[PDB]
Symmetry: C8
Subunit: 175 residues, 8 copies
Amino acid sequence: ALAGTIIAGASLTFQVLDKVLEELGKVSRKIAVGIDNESGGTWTALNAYFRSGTTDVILPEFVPNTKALLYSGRKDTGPVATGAVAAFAYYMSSGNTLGVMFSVPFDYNWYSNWWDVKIYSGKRRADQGMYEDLYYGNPYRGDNGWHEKNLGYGLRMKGIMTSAGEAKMQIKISR
Amino acid sequence: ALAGTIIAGASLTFQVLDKVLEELGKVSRKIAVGIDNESGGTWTALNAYFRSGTTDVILPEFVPNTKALLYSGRKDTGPVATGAVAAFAYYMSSGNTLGVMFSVPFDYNWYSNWWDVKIYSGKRRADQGMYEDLYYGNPYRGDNGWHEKNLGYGLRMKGIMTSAGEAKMQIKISR
Amino acid sequence: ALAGTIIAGASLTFQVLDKVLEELGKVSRKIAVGIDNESGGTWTALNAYFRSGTTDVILPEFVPNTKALLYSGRKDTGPVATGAVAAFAYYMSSGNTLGVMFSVPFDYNWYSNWWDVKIYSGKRRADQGMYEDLYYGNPYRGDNGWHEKNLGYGLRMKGIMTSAGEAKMQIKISR
Amino acid sequence: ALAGTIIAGASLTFQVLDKVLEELGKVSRKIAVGIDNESGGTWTALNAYFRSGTTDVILPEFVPNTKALLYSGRKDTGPVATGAVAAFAYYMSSGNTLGVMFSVPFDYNWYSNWWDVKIYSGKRRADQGMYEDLYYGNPYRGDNGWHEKNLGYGLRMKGIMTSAGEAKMQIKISR
Amino acid sequence: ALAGTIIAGASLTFQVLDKVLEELGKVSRKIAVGIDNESGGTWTALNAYFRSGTTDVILPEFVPNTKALLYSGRKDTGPVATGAVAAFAYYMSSGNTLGVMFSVPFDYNWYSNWWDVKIYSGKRRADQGMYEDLYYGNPYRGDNGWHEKNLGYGLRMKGIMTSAGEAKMQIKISR
Amino acid sequence: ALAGTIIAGASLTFQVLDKVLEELGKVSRKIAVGIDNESGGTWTALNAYFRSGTTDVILPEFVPNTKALLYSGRKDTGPVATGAVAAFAYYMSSGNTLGVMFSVPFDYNWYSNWWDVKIYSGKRRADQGMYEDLYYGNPYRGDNGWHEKNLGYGLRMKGIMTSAGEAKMQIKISR
Amino acid sequence: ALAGTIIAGASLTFQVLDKVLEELGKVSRKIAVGIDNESGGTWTALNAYFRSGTTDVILPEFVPNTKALLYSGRKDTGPVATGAVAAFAYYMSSGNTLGVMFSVPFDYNWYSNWWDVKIYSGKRRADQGMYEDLYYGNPYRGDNGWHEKNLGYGLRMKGIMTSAGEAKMQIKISR
Amino acid sequence: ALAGTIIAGASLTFQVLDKVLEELGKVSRKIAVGIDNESGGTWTALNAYFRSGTTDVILPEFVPNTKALLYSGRKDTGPVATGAVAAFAYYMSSGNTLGVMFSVPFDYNWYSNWWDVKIYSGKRRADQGMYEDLYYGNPYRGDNGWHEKNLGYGLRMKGIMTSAGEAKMQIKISR
Ligand SMILES: CC(C)CCC[C@@H](C)[C@H]1CC[C@H]2[C@@H]3CC=C4C[C@@H](O)CC[C@]4(C)[C@H]3CC[C@]12C
Ligand SMILES: CC(C)CCC[C@@H](C)[C@H]1CC[C@H]2[C@@H]3CC=C4C[C@@H](O)CC[C@]4(C)[C@H]3CC[C@]12C
Ligand SMILES: CC(C)CCC[C@@H](C)[C@H]1CC[C@H]2[C@@H]3CC=C4C[C@@H](O)CC[C@]4(C)[C@H]3CC[C@]12C
Ligand SMILES: CC(C)CCC[C@@H](C)[C@H]1CC[C@H]2[C@@H]3CC=C4C[C@@H](O)CC[C@]4(C)[C@H]3CC[C@]12C
Ligand SMILES: CC(C)CCC[C@@H](C)[C@H]1CC[C@H]2[C@@H]3CC=C4C[C@@H](O)CC[C@]4(C)[C@H]3CC[C@]12C
Ligand SMILES: CC(C)CCC[C@@H](C)[C@H]1CC[C@H]2[C@@H]3CC=C4C[C@@H](O)CC[C@]4(C)[C@H]3CC[C@]12C
């Protein structure tokens, strides 16, 4: 009976697809970001632009001097094969913008964790352009290594990002 | 046997529908709203009009000056493909109405999170008209970005709404 | 074999009915009622008449002045397609009766939440007549909106009822 | 094969009976009873006679003046279609017996909650006769309403019983 | 095929027996016994003789005057259709023995709860003879009723036993 | 098909054996032993010899005068039809050995709980011989009864063992 | 159909192997070792050599005089039929090495628990040679018995090991 | 029917693969690392290079003198047959680099736990070269044994690594 075999095959297809979707839904991609502000002035949040994923918290409005920013991101809920990729911008009291990019990809056999920090002149909101500038420029690997560079404008950066799918990023901005 | 194949196909259909309804019922759409009142006077609640969804709390009767409003909304219980969309109104002591709209849709490949704040002359209750004015005017995206505008009548607004299906919205109204 | 097909169909019927009855039993209809008494005298409970549903608490015997009544209702246990509909009466010290109606229906595509408050001359127990008077008169919608009216006899009402199947109602009676 | 069809039908019958017995065993009928004693003297327990059901507590030996009796009853354990129906007796210090009846039936489309209180001359134990006198006399409905009557011998009663299958009963006996 | 039908029937038999044995194993028969000693002297435990069942505690060695005995019994573990039936004996300081019998049967449509208290001259250990004397004499029903009698030797008893399969017994021995 | 019937019968056999082994592994046999030492001197542990079962605690090294020994035993883990049977020895300061035997069998329709206490001249370790001397001599039944005897050497014993598969034994040794 | 019978048999084989591997994985073999040091000097850990199994703790670096060593071992994770067998060595301040062997086998119908303690001249690391010397010499049984011997060099040992698969070992080394 | 047998075999294959992937995902490989710094100066983290696995913590930025480093590593999430293998580097205040390697493999019948510590001239980041130098040089086995060596530059090392798949490593660096 053709119909009986079709029903058996459709049932097997249903079981396999159910398992596959459950597996895809259990994949975890998220990041916890901490940034120390020793720049000498308050930071004012502009926006976070998520190329992939979303967040369960609002971008904290202010980061006073000698205080820390706590932020986080995660992939979209469900069996969707995307990660947590974003760039966010804080307007500094010195009159320039601190842009921070992270990328925690879904497919780890084509991509890796990446991150970068840059200073943009004036007031600059995070968007796809800023994310492309940070990601396709010279970003750091999320390689469990500490990295240091002069940001310019009398500011320097020191930070690290882990290599895990549930990533941690720690950065200090100093003057 | 035709009847046996019909019964097998019906059993498979029942399994598939049970799975689909369970997944539809597991979709989460909700919003938590905080509004700081620095206008210089008490706010008196008028009403919340839900275009979609409902709420587990009553609209707080009063918001005193320098205090905050806590409110929330959620989608309807069950496998129903709708979100949490509403506009609510607070009569301010200055004699005008603060109207706030949020939209957290169900289907995110056609819609996005949106929100807006406006002041209406006199005492004005939230209804479908207020929701349409806010949503089909010039609303902000729930895009994880802070936005500021002059509300008029000596009042200004600064706020943010996240992009998640479980959204957070934070607004401060200031004079 | 006719008997074998009958057994297979009966088994499928049993599975479907089991699921349907479980789903019907999971539907939740309940209400939490709070009423502030600022009338200037004690209220004495008469009775609550439930058109639909029941309650897990006794109608509180007294509500002193400046105190609040806490009451609740819910639908009947099991896969029964009814809601929580009632009218209850408190004898006020002024010599008249405060009647309160709520309706939280089961089927939300034919009915909505409704509520009302009225004052009846003398001592009047809640019954089907009082429920019909409140429900088929000019009741308020449970629309997440605050409503105000003069009850008469030097008393006024201000209250709100939410639109959810698990509803909250808040009322204040004032003089 | 006749035997194979008999075995299939027997398996279906066993599944259906298992389901039915589980549901019958999940039905809950019970009552929690509180009685305030303001008669001016101690009450001494005589006995509780359960027409249906049983109890997890002993009838409290004494109820001193200005104290309260806490008692309870429940239906029999298992898939048995019976409720919690009883009459219990307390010998009052005045020399007469306070008899209290409650009925929380199993089948609510033939029966309802009922209760009553009476005083019997002298010392009188609860039995089937007392239960029949209270139940087939003029009992109150467990209808969420407060009721008052003069018990005689200088005593009066005020009480209420809820309409739920998990019932609450509150009575005060006063002089 | 005869063998295939035999395997199908044996599988159904195994399922039915598994369910029946589980149900039999879930039946609960136990008793909690409290006895107040106001006799004027210490009691010294002799033994408890269990006609049915066993216990999870040792018979307390002594019961001083104005103190209480706490004891318990239960049916045997597993799908065995027996109850908790025992008689236990305490040697009183006056030189005679207090024997106490309880019976909590398994099959409640042939038996009921029963209990009794007696005083035996001298030192008398509990055995089958004592249990038969108490059970087949004039025992009290576990009927939720308080009972009183003169034990003799200047001692009297007042006690009660509930009618449940998880029974409570409370007795006071007084002089 | 012979092979298909063999496979069906083997599957049924595997199910039955799995159930039987699970039930056998759920049988509980254990004992908790307390021994009060009022002999006037310290006891020094020699050894415990387990005819059946084992223990989760070490034999306490010393039991000082007026202190108590806590010990325990249990049946072997798994679906093995054996109980907790042992004899253990404490060398008393008076120069003789206190030997204690307990038996909590697996199969209760052939065996019963038994226990005994004896004093052996000099220093004597527990072994199969000591266990046989105590068990096949004149042991007490674990029958929920207190028993007393003169141990000799100026020492006497009073103790009790319960009849349960999870047994409790309490002994006091006195001088 | 040969293929269908092969598939049915392979499925049964899979079920049986899954159960067997789960059973093997639940077998527990572990040991907790405590050693009191009353030798008069500090012990310095050298190494533990595991003939079978592993450990979740590091060999404690030092055991000061009048302090205790806490160590543990266990069998390898998974359905592997091996136990917890080891010898470990502590260099004593007197210039010689304390070697301790334990064996907790997997298969208890061919092996038993064993243990021993020895002193080796000089500094001697634990290895297969030391384990063979202790295990194939004259080791003590883990028989729930206390054992005493003169270790030499002015030192003596007193200890005990239980007979369980989850074993406890207590040893004191004294001078 | 060829298609029916193919579907049955595919269903069995899917069950077997599901079981195998679940078991592979349950394998646990991780390491917890503690390093005491008694060198006389602060350590500054450079980086950790993971040949296999990843980590849930960032490499601690600094290790002050007389303080300890806490670090950890684990295998990649999912049914991937790899372990936790890494080398990490701390720049010491003396001007040289402390490099530490650990290896906790997945397949224990081809590999074993290994570890090593070395000092490299100047500032030297961990990479594949450092890992190869440590692992294919003369590393210590994670064999539950303490090991000591002179690191040079006036520094010495003493440490231990356990043999478990959930490994612990303790090292002290001293001057
Ligand atoms: C072959 C037979 C059994 C098909 C029966 C039609 C099924 C597929 C139809 C009938 C009723 C339908 C539902 C009706 C209403 C809703 C609520 C809506 O917000 C989302 C879709 C959902 C949940 C529909 C899903 C599809 C549905 C279950
Ligand atoms: C076809 C065969 C298997 C039918 C067997 C008859 C079944 C349906 C009968 C036999 C015994 C019956 C039970 C006997 C006693 C009680 C207790 C009563 O308070 C509620 C009904 C209940 C629980 C009955 C339900 C129906 C029942 C289980
Ligand atoms: C067709 C074949 C498999 C039938 C085998 C007979 C079955 C039904 C018999 C054999 C042994 C029996 C058990 C033997 C002992 C007891 C303990 C008693 O206190 C209650 C009944 C109970 C639990 C019996 C229930 C019925 C029983 C399980
Ligand atoms: C038809 C084939 C599969 C039958 C195989 C024989 C079965 C029934 C036999 C083989 C080994 C046996 C077990 C061997 C040892 C023990 C430990 C003993 O203390 C209780 C019984 C128990 C648990 C036996 C139960 C019965 C048993 C499982
Ligand atoms: C008919 C086919 C499927 C049979 C395949 C052979 C099976 C029975 C064999 C192959 C590999 C074997 C395992 C190999 C290794 C171990 C670890 C050892 O410490 C205990 C036994 C155990 C767990 C073996 C059990 C039996 C085993 C699973
Ligand atoms: C008959 C058909 C369905 C066979 C399909 C091939 C199966 C057996 C193959 C295809 C892909 C394979 C996997 C690919 C990658 C990995 C990660 C590796 O670290 C461990 C093995 C594992 C998990 C492989 C296991 C075997 C695997 C699942």
